[PDB]
Design a protein around this ligand. Sequence first.
Ligand SMILES: [Zn+2]
Ligand SMILES: [Zn+2]
Lengths: 39, 104, 345, 44
Amino acid sequence: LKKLGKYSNQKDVANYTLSCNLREELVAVSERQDICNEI
Amino acid sequence: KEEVAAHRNSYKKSICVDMLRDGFHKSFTELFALMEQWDKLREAAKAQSLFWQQRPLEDQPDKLDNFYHYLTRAEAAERKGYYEEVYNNLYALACYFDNSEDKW
Amino acid sequence: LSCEVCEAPAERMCTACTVTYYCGPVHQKADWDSIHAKICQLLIPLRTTMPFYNSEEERQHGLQQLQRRQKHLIEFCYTVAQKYLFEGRHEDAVPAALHSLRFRMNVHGLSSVELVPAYLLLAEASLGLGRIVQAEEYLSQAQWTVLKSTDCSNATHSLLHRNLGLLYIAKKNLDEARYHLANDIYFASCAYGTEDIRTSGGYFHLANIFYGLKKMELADTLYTKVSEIWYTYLNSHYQALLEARSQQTDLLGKQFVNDTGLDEAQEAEAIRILTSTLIIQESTSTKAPQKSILILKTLSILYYLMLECSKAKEYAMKALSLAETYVSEEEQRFIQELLSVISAE
Amino acid sequence: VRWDLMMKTKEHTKKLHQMNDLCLEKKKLDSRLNTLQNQQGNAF
Ligand SMILES: [Zn+2]
Ligand SMILES: [Zn+2]
């Protein structure tokens, strides 16, 4: 199990990081929208 | 959109924009003066003076919120000539600022 | 090829220069006035294609001196355009601005922030022509440039916000006019500091909106702030001039130069701002004539530093007559001294 | 316990497909910026 324990903890940290990644992409998409929407 | 730019720009920017947009022009002038004073002090002083021990003001939104509420009130009073309203609001700031970092 | 001044046909030669191209007589005359009264021939040294610079050092020298001449004339053209906008000669501004833009395109390229000043002058001329959507074109370009821009300075962005506000001021939302001029005022304040004439120009446009809103006390407050700025700067020069002239005398002696230190376009904008401020300050509230006396002092000082002697005298005499009833002796004695300086100089 | 790893992977892929959608939005906005560039052309 310890192999899957290691990869499960890897996914725990990777999914939290992905939550920061999707926050990053959400600000990226919203600001790129903002460029076209302001003008 | 513009609201997103307003929150996404610095809270310092956000309150400057609110202030001058809504005619709190002198409230901006005061905020600028104090903010520059804070920055100057925290840069300039001797390397472990309390000014260098001060927190960053810009990081610290609750103090900018206190400036927003009290300066908006005090300028609304300042316009009137009802000088005691100005006194009371500025003293409310002053006593909020009755702490070691805010002494000046 | 085209009429470079408007991209209509090259209907006629520029007989003054051959290098300039005109869509016949109307643009021929307007561009003759606009660029050729200012410099005319100097564009020919720009327009001539170089013969071969034969070595690396020759190429470098020839490029450097050509480019720096181009830059110098680019800025002179942009100053001329600014003055034509302030003088209301928007017809003459259109050639000067379009030339300055095209030369910025050539040296800097269309992508440059350096075009943004010219683009905004082309908006300003368009609004002088009422061509609101045309101004919106060049503001659109500028806005994309600055939003991308890696380095836009506080002054540059203040220019952007100021012209954005002016465009909405031709539009119909006073809220946007305040919002954008406020941004201009902020960026001016942090670039220049809070007492610069350019910041005061922001405050002036804000005051004019508050006057249109008939919010008399805020409008007058803004007019006061601007008037105080203009007063303080002109005082700084006038005092320094008299103090230096007083300070010391070797047997060599000296005489100091009476000087505004302003751009002539900044002097024209000073006159426009102070005159509108005076008239609006009176019409909003004749109850404070002393503020009119202050503006009269300010303009009389400006006129003296120009040696606009006629208005310097007239406005000093007005200020003195008003100050004798309204004000303490310090005002009257200052205005008398200024009149004595004008009449002696 | 493997089921938890599978479901965490599946929701990870859900966030991948969300961001790929945003990549298509970015491609759209790139085409919009090119459209506005064509407006730059500044004929008169
Ligand atoms: Zn010519
Ligand atoms: Zn034409």
